[PDB]
């Protein structure tokens, strides 16, 4: 029932880090009704209007010499500083995945099954999950739901394998992750 | 490898709502509860390693409020165009019978940042143990939000997340059941 | 260890 027009202002200060703190880039962005109007980019070193409505601000801010000089120092006094503050529990956050494997269909030997490897609860996102049949890798018939972000500093993903289980086959889901010395492995016996 | 830390703020009229948050690689580090003037860590452990003086966010938001008024006047009171959300319902971990989990309602790609979220179990609204995040940033300057409902799974319970937003023509109803 | 904000600046009036 509320029909009133809305008016929105957003501000983003973005610190982009490469090879640790070796290379840093600072982007300040002013955004009105979802459209960016002015930005400061540390690789340019001054404010630039992104739309015409932002030109008065770029001109006003760039006319203040000492202000621009502080904004340029902020790659050190803001970006590198905050990076250092959080490194212990963000860059270095390591959380082991819970990994299980199970057949999607209960069925006799010699029939066509989907074996499932759920890998959940891990951080960071970088992870490699491979399927093995009797000690041999299999890159055919592996299909994965891709990497999903739970918004709670964890990730999950499902990796499926289409196979025909045969009498002596032992199947292994292998997963490599920064949190773990050597790959994790979980088996399913036919 | 590359990383990105974002300080993201917003102020919205006429609702008079404002938020202040830091984001690391798409996850929230903290936001500031402006009413209590307290830093809210997304995980408890963060507050044991770092601090943030919450009061400072109020100064930024005061200036945001002033800028919004200036830009509103500058645009000749031109309002924001509503962008309606899309809504996914999922779980943080695989669902197993009689094993407590949490239902996630993920609301994505919407603006302005005002949304009404309802949890429905067997068709009736339920709020026991619910929590939610603040409005999270996106590179296109739209918003994301996560709502959570802890629950124990059964074959007898059916669930819906109902999302209301001004860019929709009718509430979005997203469904989930054990399968 | 203390996070620091960057200040929002006032637009041209």
């Amino acid at each position, epitope marked *: 029932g509320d029909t009133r027009p809305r008016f929105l202002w957003q501000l983003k200060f973005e610190c982009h880090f490469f090879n640790g703190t070796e290379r840093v880039r600072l982007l300040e962005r002013c955004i009105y009704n979802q459209e960016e109007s002015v930005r400061f980019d540390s690789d340019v070193g001054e404010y630039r209007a992104v739309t015409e409505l932002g030109r008065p601000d770029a001109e006003y801010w760039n006319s203040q010499k000492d202000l621009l*000089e502080q904004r340029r120092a902020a790659v*050190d006094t803001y970006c590198r*500083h905050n990076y250092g503050v959080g490194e212990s529990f963000t860059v270095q956050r390591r959380v082991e995945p819970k990994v299980t494997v199970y057949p999607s269909k209960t069925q006799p030997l010699q029939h066509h099954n989907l074996l499932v490897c759920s890998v959940s609860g891990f951080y960071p996102g970088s992870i490699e999950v491979r399927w093995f049949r009797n000690g041999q890798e299999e890159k055919a018939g592996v299909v994965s739901t891709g990497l999903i972000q739970n918004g709670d500093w964890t990730f999950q993903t499902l990796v499926m394998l289409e196979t025909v289980p045969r009498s002596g086959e032992v199947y292994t889901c292998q997963v490599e992750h920064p949190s773990v010395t050597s790959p994790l492995t979980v088996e399913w016996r036919a | 490898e590359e990383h990105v830390i974002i300080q993201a703020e917003f102020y919205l009229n006429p609702d008079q709502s404002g938020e202040f948050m830091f984001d690391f690689d798409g996850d929230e580090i903290f936001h500031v509860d402006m009413a209590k003037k307290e830093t809210v860590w997304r995980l408890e452990e963060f507050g044991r390693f770092a601090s943030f003086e919450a009061q400072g966010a109020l100064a930024n938001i005061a200036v945001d409020k002033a800028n919004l008024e200036i830009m509103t006047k500058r645009s000749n009171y031109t309002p924001i165009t509503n962008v309606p959300p899309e809504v996914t319902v999922l779980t943080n971990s695989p669902v197993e019978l009689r094993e407590p989990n949490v239902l996630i309602c993920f609301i994505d790609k919407f603006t302005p940042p005002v949304v009404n979220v309802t949890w429905l179990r067997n068709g009736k609204p339920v709020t026991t143990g619910v929590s939610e995040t603040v409005f999270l940033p996106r590179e296109d300057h739209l918003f994301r939000k996560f709502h959570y409902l802890p629950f124990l799974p059964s074959t007898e319970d059916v669930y819906d997340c109902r999302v209301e937003h001004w860019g929709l023509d009718e509430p979005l109803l997203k469904h989930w059941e054990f399968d | 260890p*203390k996070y620091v904000k960057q200040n929002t600046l*006032k637009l041209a009036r």
Partner: T-cell receptor
Amino acid sequence: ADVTQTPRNRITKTGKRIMLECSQTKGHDRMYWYRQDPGLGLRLIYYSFDVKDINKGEISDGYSVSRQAQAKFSLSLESAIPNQTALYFCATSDESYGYTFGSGTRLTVVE
Amino acid sequence: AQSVTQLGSHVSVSEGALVLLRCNYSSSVPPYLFWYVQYPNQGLQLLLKYTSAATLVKGINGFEAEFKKSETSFHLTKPSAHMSDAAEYFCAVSEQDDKIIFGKGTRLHILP
């Protein structure tokens, strides 16, 4: 003359509530009340980052403030005592640590 | 912020000689640093402001100050003391928290 304080000079007896007023013309969100005493520098009493926003400083005991409007910041001695004799300075700050101090209020509290 | 320490509540300098007023600071974050002057029967005037833009900060009247992180110092200097430099001088710090915390002040006395 962006920052104006009144009164400039005040005597008061102890035990009384006393109000000092600060007004600004620059529209700054940040305002501050400090007091200055020989050998202690300026100490921050209270500060405000927005309308109705109130934060205690180093020495807020025996003081209160109100910030009903952006242009004005009021300091009250709740129940004046002699050691609140001092020079009181209000200040504003812009968004990049540019402070403007008022001219000062010389307040003497006598028994 | 956290703290600033000025040395000496009253100090002297001969007319014409170098002025040096000492300030050391304590801060967990890269600070804003300031020097203010209060001339007799007046208010507070900013002399100079460190913003991390540069270690050598220049102010009005020949005042300067060098930010030295390794000794956490920010000492104020002026090449030649004039009688009109008689005043009280305050160093100050902010731990990027939108509040200035002042040192105790040093009163400079000029010997004619």
